[PDB]
């Protein structure tokens, strides 16, 4: 039984006339009562005298009157922890919001600092609106980072810096044999699958999802379907995807044969050599202009002026080789037989133990929770509809060419699985002949 403000069982009888049969409950001699608001900025609590007819914006103005009259409060909003909701509709009355004297509100900046661990393992800090839906916050973070197609990325809670321009282009190898082994968590498949409970709800705000101010979230490619991945202008996007692939292989989040590992290692070694090449200085005795340009340029310019023009053009040429090599690494990673599958714990109808539902860009897979061996695959192209029974935490998928599929997940896993299916269905409707026409309204309709 939920109690207090904002429930069906309030502690005080509201809407009582001052001159009624007796005084209103919990009210002063003038009919007002105290609302206590914690102003996070100042670590202080502030009490206000209000009635139920006062507007949310009224409460905000009363707060500002009591605090610094010169300070910028334009970014602050009321946050209601108990009900996990912001109070942005400022014309609502306290009675409309269910707010009585027991309510504990916060007056807090909407924009806060947030630590992100990037796929290249570096930490950055960004200022993001904690009241925007995470879908929009991720889109805004990717724009800051100059990463196109933000709908392929999202935020992931770490399983149990710097303030953006150039750390997004960082791509270096692990420092020590023992720094790498320190990062290697020998993990079974079930424990990898539990990590996927931490993908944030794209339809809710950071504030509603238990994110401390200086808690680090993982910015990660979430959906393994990369639209128009173009070396001519996706340098940052490619570098971060490559880095995600590089670490996933070094850390055995995805398996490969010994011969594949030696190939990925040579390709990483090569990429690191090409990266040294883009910044190797004193490039002097190497450049002999007499061998590189036609003789008319020799006579029209001094050698040290040609050498300079050649070295300036070479910077862009070398970056292109660097990006092409990373593209080749990504393409080999995409060809691994388990690529692109995100695993969730699930009890299949008629099954004996907990197994896995694997979700890929084009299919659902029933898999063994110990070995990851695929048992049964269903194609999205045969899927007609799907639903979640939020009472019994049951996902049911209907098909055109066989009987429905039903499985049970934990409550958290049900929400995440539903957004993955809806998300991949959304991504499949992206059309080459299009502009940045990211139908936000369509993503929300499929994942909520």
């Amino acid at each position: 039984v939920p109690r207090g403000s904002g429930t069906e069982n309030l502690y005080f009888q509201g809407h009582m006339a001052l001159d009624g049969i007796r005084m209103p409950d919990g009210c002063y001699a003038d009919g007002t009562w105290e609302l206590s608001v914690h102003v996070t900025d100042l670590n202080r609590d502030v009490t206000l005298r209000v009635t139920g007819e006062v507007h949310i914006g009224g409460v905000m103005l009363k707060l500002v009157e009591k605090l610094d009259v010169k300070k910028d409060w334009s970014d602050h909003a009321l946050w209601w922890e108990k009900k996990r909701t912001w109070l942005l509709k400022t014309h609502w009355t306290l009675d409309k919001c269910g707010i009585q004297a027991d309510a504990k509100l916060q007056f807090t900046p909407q924009h806060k600092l947030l630590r992100l661990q990037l796929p290249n393992m570096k930490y950055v800090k960004v200022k993001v609106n904690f009241s925007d839906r995470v879908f929009k916050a991720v889109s805004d973070i990717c724009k800051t980072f100059n990463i196109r197609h933000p709908e392929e990325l999202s935020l992931l809670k770490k399983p149990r810096p710097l303030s953006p321009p150039g750390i997004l282009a960082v791509s270096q190898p692990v420092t020590s044999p023992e720094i790498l082994a320190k990062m290697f968590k020998p993990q079974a498949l079930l424990d990898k699958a539990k990590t996927n409970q931490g993908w944030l709800d794209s339809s809710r705000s950071l504030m509603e999802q238990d994110v401390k101010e200086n808690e680090a979230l993982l910015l990660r490619f979430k959906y393994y379907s990369f639209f128009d991945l173009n070396p001519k202008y996706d340098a940052i996007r490619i570098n971060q995807l490559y880095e995600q692939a590089k670490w996933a292989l070094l850390l055995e989040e995805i398996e490969c044969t010994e011969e594949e590992m030696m190939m990925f290692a040579a390709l990483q070694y090569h990429i690191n050599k090409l990266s040294i090449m883009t910044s190797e200085n004193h490039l002097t005795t190497d450049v002999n202009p007499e061998c590189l340009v036609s003789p008319r340029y020799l006579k029209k310019y001094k050698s040290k002026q040609i050498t300079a023009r050649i070295l300036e053009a070479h910077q862009n040429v070398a970056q292109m080789s660097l990006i092409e090599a990373k593209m080749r690494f990504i393409q080999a990673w995409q060809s691994l037989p388990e690529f692109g599958i995100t695993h969730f714990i699930a009890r299949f109808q008629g099954g004996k133990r907990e197994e896995l539902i694997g979700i890929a860009y084009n299919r659902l897979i029933r898999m063994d929770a110990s070995t990851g061996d695929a048992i049964k695959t269903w194609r999205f192209s045969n899927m007609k509809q799907w639903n979640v029974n939020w009472e019994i935490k049951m996902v049911t998928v209907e098909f055109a060419d066989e009987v429905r599929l039903s499985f049970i997940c934990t409550e958290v896993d049900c929400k995440v699985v539903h957004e993955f299916i809806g998300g991949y269905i959304f991504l499949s409707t992206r059309a080459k002949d299009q502009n940045e026409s990211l139908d936000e309204e369509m993503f929300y309709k499929l994942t909520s």
Binding site: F380, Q385, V388, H418, I421, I425, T429, L446
Partner: peptide, 12 residues
Amino acid sequence: AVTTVVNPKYEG
């Protein structure tokens, strides 16, 4: 309740 979502491939 339930949240029924139809694959646009089929209807809507």
